[PDB]
Amino acid sequence: SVPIYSIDEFFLQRKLRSELGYKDTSVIQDLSEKILNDIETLEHNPVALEQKLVDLLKFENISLAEFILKNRSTIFWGIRLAKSTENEIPNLIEKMVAKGLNDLVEQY
Structure with missing residues (x-):
């Protein structure tokens, strides 16, 4: 029900x-x-x-x-992906560090 790719910045x-x-x-x-x-x-x-x-x-x-x-989990990590502009490359490190939750397999 609703993949991670579908959730943009202003989804919620x-x-x-x-x-x-x-x-x-x-x-x-x-x-x-x-x-x-x-x-x-x-x-x-x-x-x-x-x-x-x-x-x-x-x-x-x-x-x-x-x-x-x-x-x-999908919406919280989903909106965090689309929100960060300019300073998005430090957030793509944060998703690797925040891997206590299950692995959301999804690419662009």
């Missing part, structure tokens, strides 16, 4: 606008980064991450948690 921002409905960009910018910041901290366990995501996205009303749960 577009998914939030379509599902939630937020017209404003700076509401999406904070909310996209706020979900991403929760993921990196709670990579240690999946069940604790669902507790926070249910609160941010405002309960079963919207939900959208299972979509982020299955793609938690």
Whole structure:
């Protein structure tokens, strides 16, 4: 469900606008980064991450948690690939160092 190549820089921002409905960009910018910041901290366990995501996205009303749960690693490392411009070559070293997670086999 959704490869790593498909996830561009503004992938999570577009998914939030379509599902939630937020017209404003700076509401999406904070909310996209706020979900991403929760993921990196709670990579240690999946069940604790669902507790926070249910609160941010405002309960079963919207939900959208299972979509982020299955793609938690893919989106976080996916957006980091497209974000870095000019200083992208030090980030391509960081992906080699950050290899505690499973090997995402994907090339350009």
